[PDB]
UniProtKB/Swiss-Prot annotation, chains A, B, C:
Tissue: Photocytes.
Biotechnology annotation for this entry: Green fluorescent protein has been engineered to produce a vast number of variously colored mutants, fusion proteins, and biosensors. Further generation of mutants led to more stable proteins (at 37 degrees Celsius for example) with brighter fluorescence and longer fluorescence lifetimes.
Protein's GO biological process: bioluminescence; generation of precursor metabolites and energy
Name of the molecule in the record: Green fluorescent protein
From Swiss-Prot, chain D:
Lineage: Eukaryota, Metazoa, Cnidaria, Hydrozoa, Hydroidolina
Consequence when changing residue 38 to N: In EBFP1.2; shifts the excitation and emission spectra to shorter wavelengths and increases quantum yields compared to BFP
Annotated organism of origin: Aequorea victoria (Water jellyfish)
Phenotypic consequence of residue 65 to H: In P4; leads to no detectable fluorescence. In mut2.2; shifts fluorescence lifetime from 3.03 to 1.94 ns. In mut3.3; shifts fluorescence lifetime from 3.03 to 1.88 ns
Protein name per Swiss-Prot or TrEMBL: Green fluorescent protein
Practical application: Green fluorescent protein has been engineered to produce a vast number of variously colored mutants, fusion proteins, and biosensors. Further generation of mutants led to more stable proteins (at 37 degrees Celsius for example) with brighter fluorescence and longer fluorescence lifetimes.
GO biological process: bioluminescence; generation of precursor metabolites and energy
Keyword flag Cytoplasm: no
Mutation effect (residue 99 to E): In mut1.27; shifts fluorescence lifetime from 3.03 to 2.85 ns
Effect of residue 199 to I: Suppresses the 475 nm excitation peak, leaving only the shorter wavelength peak at 399 nm. In H9; increases fluorescence at 395 nm excitation
Length: 223, 223, 223, 226
């Protein structure tokens, strides 16, 4: 379960999205090194240009790559589902704007950890910070609070992200998350704890496609 | 006691307010899911327009809905009072402005958890950020520090909130709180600990009344 | 020792100051309620007008009033010295500006906890934020890191404060502190831990003297 | 005097950096002292080649985590002192938001009674009119958290952290640090459980030093084990 993550694992991400009727797709590829909580991914919009800012898609675009320290190993739900994996669902409410609803399957396809997602965004403002593209290309560090959900044999999580806006304000997104295993194998249901995240977004100056390069470090703490 | 909160519980909130002589009332309705620390409430001003910003009323408008993790269950004062409930009193000092004094009864009325409040505000500046309505419609995340009060058979709490102002500054409100059980049944007096809060305020575009929609997630930590 | 702080204790503060040759004095009076980490003080400049902002004097103007939770009672150095008390010395380095050197005696005189201080400030800029009075009248929350000093039979502490400047920046003050008992009685030398502080400054609209009203809540944590 | 014992008093420090950023070569020398018992350092740095081509704040993290205060209960988790006096190699990659990267390699060890940090730094792909080569970073420093992880294969540690650099327009520019430390000797070392270092720093100027220079005071403590 854990054993599938002891080395460098290749990652594939596919997203099909529709926000206020604007349809788009994203494909990402890279690799994860869970032993040290690290991911590097590169994403392209395969349908032309994204109709929303990249930073709004970061949280939707594999918490099985978090570093769980030794003493918290029995609290790593995400890896304990693998290889059959899990369904991750969220509702994401943007301050003063619309909402994303997402559903994703996270599992191994051969040697690759794959995250396949559907996203639906509704009630955004056409001249808001999202559809108006006024969010800075960067990302803050966040804390994801994880709770067992014994009835679903999985977890829930709750967290706010803070997105910098070009006028120097921050726009919050409140995330409600639930994860459910796909297989019937046993899983590790955790005591409450958090994941601390740090991310850096960057650009490849020679990629003419709409794109995002992402590096991330995630670790678990609080037991 | 705890058993009253194991599912979704309907909530009713009623506030009678007077700030610098301006009288108003608010009614709120929604539901709470203490198992995962969640609340959703919708509030209306039933007297016309509020004389103060909505964000100034959030803290006054049911800490019995906080998620206490399993190991901290013996520290959940709030639920241990139920159904007879508790009196919550606060003094709230606004930076460079007036103060709110509040008193509230929190208890079950039938299957509904009801928070009934009186609020009195004094010495506000007529052209300050409060009576001048210069506070942003949003809310930050906060830490509420909880202490047992053995003499009162209850608790005290202390915390600052930070309210964003439209000129990009923050205005602090310093909260002094005390809670006292209404019944004589035994209660759980806690070791020191905190509640971490996260909130999102929103608007219903079709509600013409002065109103606030609130979603909140609260969890206990620090033992 | 602890027993001296079980109720409300009156406080007296006296400061003699000289900053770049500008001499001034301050007297404060109020009371502290260490059981709940609280204090309220009112300070006046007894020599006319202060030559530096009030916020620069807050840290120098009784950590014996911090709330130590039950499990941390053996780590409360400050109360363990009482009534004979302690000498508190600091060096305070202001970002891009001068420094304060302070020495204070903190001890009971009769039933009153008295803080008597000498402050010497050097190398301030005449048109900096301090001597130019460009610091906002407010205060942030801070973390004071406490370490035993076995050779001195006391403690050291280190912390930065952050002072809001009227142009929207923050100016840091780095504090180096040391406390030494006055008596030869035994004291409690603590394990490393912190004090978390929260403060609110206010003004009495009918006090014509240069003055500061201060409310503060301080608690110990981290064992 | 081995490991921890070498740090019980005040230890003199020497720092030497050879740098090249987008082809601009420079050197820095620092001297001062560290008092690990209370997590404190005071250092003064000069650019010995004229003027620095990048802001001083971009060099602070590269310019001796052996001076951190490890509290008593965390003593078995102090990798850095356990290597001494033979010391360690510290390597980093530092990625600046919207700009280039630094790669650094440093040897940290005792030379006689002095703890010496000798560094090579190479910066690439910076923008000529960015905040770094354009000198638009404020002369100050924030407080940070450095997350430390054992690396059992290398007999050492890794660390990960973001710094946040204030920019003159009131924004912050993040630098993401990837770090690895490897002992130089073959003696045994202390491999830690996960934990963090909390940092606080103050930069200042000596009004009578005409050279390009930085005075730095810092306090670092370890935390996060039961
Ligand atoms: Na988001
Ligand atoms: Na996102
Ligand atoms: Na408030
Ligand atoms: Na409020
Ligand atoms: Na200060
Ligand atoms: Na101060
Ligand atoms: Na840096
Ligand atoms: Na740096």
């Amino acid at each position: 379960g854990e054993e599938l993550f002891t080395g460098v694992v290749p990652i594939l991400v596919e997203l099909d999205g529709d926000v206020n009727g604007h349809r788009f797709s994203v494909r990402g590829e890279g690799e994860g090194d869970a032993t040290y909580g690290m991911l590097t991914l590169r994403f392209i919009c395969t349908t032309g240009r994204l109709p929303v800012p990249w930073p709004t898609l970061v949280t939707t675009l594999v918490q099985c790559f978090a570093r769980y320290p030794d003493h918290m190993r029995r609290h790593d739900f995400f890896k304990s589902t693998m290889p059959e994996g899990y369904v991750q669902e969220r509702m994401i409410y943007f301050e003063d704007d619309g909402a994303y609803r997402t559903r994703a399957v996270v599992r191994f396809e051969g040697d690759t950890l794959v995250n396949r997602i559907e996203l639906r965004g509704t009630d955004f403002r056409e001249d808001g910070n999202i559809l108006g593209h006024r969010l800075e290309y960067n990302f803050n560090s966040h804390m994801v609070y994880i709770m067992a959900d014994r009835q679903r044999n999985g977890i829930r999580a709750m967290f706010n992200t803070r997105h910098n806006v070009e006028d120097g304000s921050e726009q919050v997104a409140m995330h409600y998350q639930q994860n459910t295993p796909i297989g019937d194998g046993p899983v590790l249901l955790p005591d409450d704890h958090y994941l601390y995240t740090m991310s850096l977004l960057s650009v490849d100056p020679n990629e003419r496609r709409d794109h995002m390069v992402l590096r991330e470090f995630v670790m678990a703490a609080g037991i």
